[PDB]
Every structure is written in structure tokens, then in C-alpha cells.
Amino acid sequence: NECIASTSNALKVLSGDEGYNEDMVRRANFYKENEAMLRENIEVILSNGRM
Amino acid sequence: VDSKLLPKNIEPPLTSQYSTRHDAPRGLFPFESYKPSVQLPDMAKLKKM
Amino acid sequence: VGIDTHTATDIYQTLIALNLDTTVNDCLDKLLNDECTESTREN
Amino acid sequence: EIPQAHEIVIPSYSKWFNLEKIHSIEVQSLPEFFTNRIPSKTPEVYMR
Amino acid sequence: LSTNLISKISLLRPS
Amino acid sequence: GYDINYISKIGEKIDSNKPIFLFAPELGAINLHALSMSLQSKNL
Amino acid sequence: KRVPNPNFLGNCNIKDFKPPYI
Amino acid sequence: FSNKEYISRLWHTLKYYQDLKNTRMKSITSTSQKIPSASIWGNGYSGYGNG
Amino acid sequence: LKKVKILEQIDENWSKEDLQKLLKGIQEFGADWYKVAKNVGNKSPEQCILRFLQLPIEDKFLYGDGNGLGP
Amino acid sequence: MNTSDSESTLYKYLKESKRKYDEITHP
């Protein structure tokens, strides 16, 4: 499992792509365990007027 | 004695419910491309075939 | 042998769209037909 | 009550400033209002 | 245009 | 399944032209007081 | 001829930036 | 999702960022000629307090 | 069928009527969160944006609950 | 793909209608 997870990740860096894992952030428990940073970032984007 | 007839402080009135904008620096927000598609994708051809 | 990951991902996108559209049209019919209850029409 | 007749801009690093609330930076910057040694310097006096 | 659908078209999208 | 020498050869140029952060000529008037007050802001 | 300052009600310099989906 | 599409995606990504760097250079040479153009990032501050 | 029962997210800070007014307001006005929180009432726009983010809409159509999806 | 209830009922309806069609067009 370390040979596969460090091969696709070895392709993502060499291709130049970046970002989160698409299949991790697609569910709803990600935005419930990261409840702290979203209340910061929503206020930061809304108060600056970009939301 | 009825309230608002009690003696109150002579002060500048409250500015609590005021709307403020923010001076954010240059590199704070990322550059954004790829406008997201709000509209749902249609699958008429797949279910037609 | 056993390598196709890619077609599996594409038909997984297709099947996810199929099941999502099935539930969407189910709730759409259950709200559009009033022969269905309001607890699955207005719901 | 007076309606808003001006444009109000505070810088982005002052996002934490909220009325009727005392932030930690206000405590670590002005500690004399929060060490209960002088009775004429209370956090109610600081908020006023 | 049928009145079974006119009551539901503005219901499904309020615009 | 790929020819990853060509993929990395193109991805080097992609990483070079990617907008990661500002360069030196496009920073504008750097204000030291704004930086010094933002470092004490305990934001991220 | 009056000229409004940037501290005028509705004449800020920080324009409202729009999100990409809008 | 094959190789011949995964490299054609990377050609239709590098050619975007080359035009983006052309825009970034033109918006630098505009302000160096004392013409206030906007950049990829927003304009930073206003006359309020900070310069 | 395997339908998404979206109105079962009725956790004590929110309510079923609040979620219904939230969905009807976002369908009314697209992503203008001040008008949306105005239509809902008694809640800040940040709570509306957060509860719109945390809705389990597509989780009942994905594969797993939380073995593994593999490659 | 899983199912749909009205799709399944209209499938058996159309299948029985087509069966009666091919059984009534022969004589």
C-alpha cells in the first residue's frame, strides 16, 4: 500500500498538478472534522467580500 | 421611575451595527481560474442509447 | 491481467450519475405527483 | 442610534476586533487591566 | 402550459 | 503506462510557469508596519 | 463642484470582487 | 485517460500559463511605465493608512 | 429506493423549517448569502454557508461508508 | 444501475403489450 500511494503521488508531483485528494473532500465527514478552519475561512472570505 | 427617564451618560452613541470593509494585502487570496459549472450535467444521450 | 482501473473509474462516474439521477427523478415524481404524500411531496 | 454615514475600513489583520468581546491580543498587549491588582483598572473600565 | 404544470414550474424554481 | 520522461519534461515547464506566489518586481510598495502587525495577528 | 473623498458612504476604493461561480 | 490524452491535457495547461506569464509581464511593464494597471493578484491596499 | 433524506439533519442549532427555508432561499437567490440569511432569519450568513457546505448530499451515492476503494 | 419503480412497472407493461402485439399480429 506504500508502493501504490507513493507511485500515484509520485505522478502528481511530476505532472505538476496539486490540490487535495478528490475522493476525500467529496464526502461530508471532511467538513465536519474540519469545522474549525471553515468558520475562520468563511468569515475571512465574506468580510473581504469574495463569497 | 420609568426607564429612559433615568439619567444617562452623555456619550457618542453606539456604532456597533456598522459595516466594515477590510484592506487585505496583495498575496492573501489566490488566483482563481476555471469558473465552476452550477448547472447539472445532462445524461439524455446515455439513457437514450 | 487485472489492469483497467481507468474504464472502472469512467463507468463509476457513469453509475454515480445514474443513481443520482434516479433519486432526483424519484423525489421529483414524488413531489410532482400529488398522489404521493406531502411528507414525500413537500419533503 | 445613528445611521452609517461614512465608509469604514479596518485592515485585514484587525479582523479579530469585535465589540463587547476582549481578544487575547488585547490581553497580551495591555496586561494592566486584567491583573487584578488595582481596583480602578478592571476589564469593564477597559471595555468602556 | 397546462395548469397541472404551471403551478409546479414556479414551485420547482421560484425564479 | 506512460512515457514519464516526456511527462516530467513538460511538467517542469508547467511548474515553472505556475502562479505560486508573487515575484520581486510585482510586490508593490512593501509596508513593513503592515507585515509587523500581521505577524502578531495570530491568523494563518 | 463637489468631489467625494474615499471616506464617503458608497465611494470606497475596495471594490467588491466577485466569485468565479457568479 | 490514456497517455495520448494525458499529455494533450498538459499541453492545454502549459499554454495557458505561458499566456498568463505574458499577462503578468505586461502588467509589470505597465506599472514600470507609470501606468496603474491591475495584476493577477488584486490591488493590495488603498490610501487608507497603509500606502 | 436509496433516496437521500436531506431533512434528517435537524441538529439542535438548526431545525427542519430552517433547512427548508435555507434550501428555498438558495433556490430563490443563487449565492447571495445576505439575502439568503434574510430569508431564513435569526441566523448569521456564515452559519448558512457552513450548513450548506456540511450537507450530506452526494454521500449516499458514493461507494463507501467513510474496506477500501483501492486505486 | 440499481432500479426505478415506475421504470420497472412500465417495463413489464410494455413487455406484456409487445407480447400481446406479436401474439395478435400472427393470426
Distance of CA A43 to the CA centre of its chain: 19
Taking each helix axis from N to C end, the angle separating A8-15 and F4-16, rounded to the nearest 10 degrees, works out to: 50
Give the type of residue at A41: N
Residue of G7, G13, G17 to mutate, testing the H interface (most H Cβ within 10 Å of its Cβ): G13
Query: How close is the nearest chain G Cα to the Cα of B6, in Å?
Result: 35
Chains that touch G (3 or more CB pairs under 8 A): A, B, D, H, I
What DSSP character marks residue D32?
A: G
* Contact call for residues A1 and I67 (beta carbons, < 8 A): no
The residue among H8, G2, H48, I68 whose CA lies nearest residue A15 is H8
- H1 contacts on C by Cβ (under 8 Å): 6, 9-10
Residues whose CB is less than 8 angstroms from the CB of residue C22 and which lie 6 or more positions away in sequence, other chains included: I1, J1, J2, J3, J4
Burial of D13 per CB tally in 10 Å (0-12, 13-18, 19+)? buried
The residue among C24, C28, F26, G6 whose CA lies nearest residue H41 is F26
A4 φ/ψ angles, rounded to the nearest 5 degrees: -90, -45
* CA angle (A18, A20, A22) in 5-degree steps: 110
Q: How many CB atoms lie within 10 A of CB D48?
A: 8
Partner residues linked to D10 by β-bridges: B22
* Contact call for residues F16 and H18 (beta carbons, < 8 A): no
Please give the full DSSP string across C5-43, using - where no structure is assigned. Answer: HHHHHHHHHHHHHHHHHHHHHHHHHHHH-SSS-TTTTT-
Residues whose CB is less than 8 angstroms from the CB of residue H46 and which lie 6 or more positions away in sequence, other chains included: B23, D9, G6, G12, G13, G14
Way the structure was solved: cryo-EM
Q: Does B42 touch chain H (CB under 8 A)?
A: no
What would the grid cell of residue B2 be? 420609568
* Contact call for residues B27 and F22 (beta carbons, < 8 A): yes
Establish whether chain D is in contact with chain E, requiring a minimum of 3 CB pairs below 8 angstroms: no
Give the type of residue at F3: D
Residues whose CB is less than 8 angstroms from the CB of residue I67 and which lie 6 or more positions away in sequence, other chains included: none
- A36 contacts on F by Cβ (under 8 Å): none
- G12 contacts on D by Cβ (under 8 Å): 7, 9
Taking each helix axis from N to C end, the angle separating I45-53 and A35-48, rounded to the nearest 10 degrees, works out to: 130
D11: nearest CA partner in chain B:
B23
Question: Strand, coil or helix: what is D8?
Answer: strand
Q: How many CB atoms lie within 10 A of CB A33?
A: 7
What DSSP character marks residue D31?
A: G
The residue among I61, I62, G20, C5 whose CA lies nearest residue A24 is I62
Question: Strand, coil or helix: what is D10?
Answer: strand
Q: Does I28 touch chain E (CB under 8 A)?
A: yes
* Contact call for residues B41 and F37 (beta carbons, < 8 A): no
Burial of I62 per CB tally in 10 Å (0-12, 13-18, 19+)? middle
Burial of C33 per CB tally in 10 Å (0-12, 13-18, 19+)? exposed
Residue of C15, C21, C27 to mutate, testing the B interface (most B Cβ within 10 Å of its Cβ): C21
Give the type of residue at E14: P
Of the CA atoms within 13 Å of residue J27, those in its CB half-sphere come to 3
* Contact call for residues J4 and C22 (beta carbons, < 8 A): yes
CA atoms of D3 and C43, how far apart (whole Å): 42
3-state SS of B1-49 is: CCCCCCCCCCCCCCCCCCCEEEECCCCCCCCCCCCCCCCCCCCHHHHHC
End-to-end CA distance of chain C: 48
What would the grid cell of residue C18 be? 445514474
Query: How would you label I40-53 residue by residue, b for 16+ Cβ within 10 Å and e otherwise?
Result: beebebbbbbbbbe
CA atoms of C42 and C33, how far apart (whole Å): 11
